[PDB]
Amino acid sequence: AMEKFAEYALSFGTEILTVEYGPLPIGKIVSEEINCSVYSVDPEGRVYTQAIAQWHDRGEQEVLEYELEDGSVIRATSDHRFLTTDYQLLAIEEIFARQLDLLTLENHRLPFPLLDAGTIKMVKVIGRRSLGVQRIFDIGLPQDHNFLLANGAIAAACFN
Ligand SMILES: [Ca+2]
Ligand SMILES: [Ca+2]
Ligand SMILES: [Zn+2]
């Protein structure tokens, strides 16, 4: 029984897919407290949008750059959780260690069923390297605790 999650964080350059501005580095969003909407998935698999509720500058620390099978990367703390194809939110290091698949997403269109729209891909983490100390951040959302990155990966949001 998990007491709580680690206070994971994303590196400055990690781009979040915003509705109003498209891909934007989380560092910019937080540093400038940019009000915009992100895409998230609910417990029943519906993809929908929600406005950011909290902007947290987490300071700095050692971060790793994980490389995905399609060449994209995730720059974050090793314990940052992401959605897998089994629909579990697990640390990126676990996904790497166990070679699990990240569940990624490659008129009115929203909200829509995750499995019946958008190009769904099953992407493994093929490696990682250290980027040294970088500025880190996270954002809090008013509803579900996850949001889509520009590379399609679904990241866990702040639980505070
Ligand atoms: Ca694959
Ligand atoms: Ca892509
Ligand atoms: Zn936070």
Q: How many domains does the chain have?
A: 1
* CATH code of the domain covering residue 75: 2.170.16.10
Distance 69 CA to ligand 1 centre (A): 7
**How far apart are the CA of 7 and the centre of ligand 3, in A?**
8
DSSP assignment of 99-135 equals TPPEEEE-----SEEGGGSS-EEEE-EEEEEEEEEEE
**How far is ligand 3, taken at its centre, from the CA of residue 56, in Å?**
5
Structure determined via: X-ray
Question: CB under 8 Å, gap of 24 or more: what pairs does 52-56 form?
Answer: 52/139, 52/140, 52/141, 53/139, 53/140, 53/141, 53/142, 54/139, 54/140, 54/141, 54/158, 54/160, 55/29, 55/30, 55/137, 55/139, 55/140, 56/30, 56/137, 56/138, 56/139, 56/140, 56/158
Segments forming the whole domain that contains residue 142: 1-160
CB 16 within 8 A of CB 36: no
Tell me how far apart the alpha carbons of residues 35 and 39 are, in angstroms, rounded to a whole number. 14
